[PDB]
Amino acid sequence: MYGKLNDLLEDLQEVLKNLHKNWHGGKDNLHDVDNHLQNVIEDIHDFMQGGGSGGKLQEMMKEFQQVLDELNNHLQGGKHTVHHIEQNIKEIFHHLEELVHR
Numbered sequence: 001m002y003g004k005l006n007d008l009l010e011d012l013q014e015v016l017k018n019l020h021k022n023w024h025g026g027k028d029n030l031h032d033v034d035n036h037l038q039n040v041i042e043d044i045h046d047f048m049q050g051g052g053s054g055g056k057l058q059e060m061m062k063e064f065q066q067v068l069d070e071l072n073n074h075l076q077g078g079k080h081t082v083h084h085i086e087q088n089i090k091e092i093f094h095h096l097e098e099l100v101h102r
Contacts, residue, residue: 013093015085021059022078023071037067
C-alpha cells in the first residue's frame with residue numbers, strides 16, 4: 001500500500017533544482033550534493049514498497065537533508081530559494097517518517 005508517499009517526495013527532489021542556483025555558486029558543486037538527494041529519492045522510492053522500510057528513513061533521511069546542508073550553509077544571497085526547499089524538504093521528513101511511523 002505504502003508508495004504514493006513518493007508523490008510528495010518528488011517535490012523535494014524538484015525543489016533542489018532551485019537550491020542549485022542559490023546554494024553557494026551553481027550546479028557544478030551542487031551536482032555532488034543534489035546527487036546525494038537524487039540518489040536518496042530512489043532509496044526512499046524503493047523503500048516505500050518495503051525495500052528497507054522502517055530503518056532506512058532514519059539514516060537515509062539525513063542524506064536528503066545533508067544536501068540542504070552544503071546549501072543552507074552557503075545561501076548565496078538566495079534564501080528565498082532554499083526557504084522554499086527547506087520548508088519543503090524539512091517538511092518532507094514529516095510525510096516520510098509519518099508514513100512508516102503511521
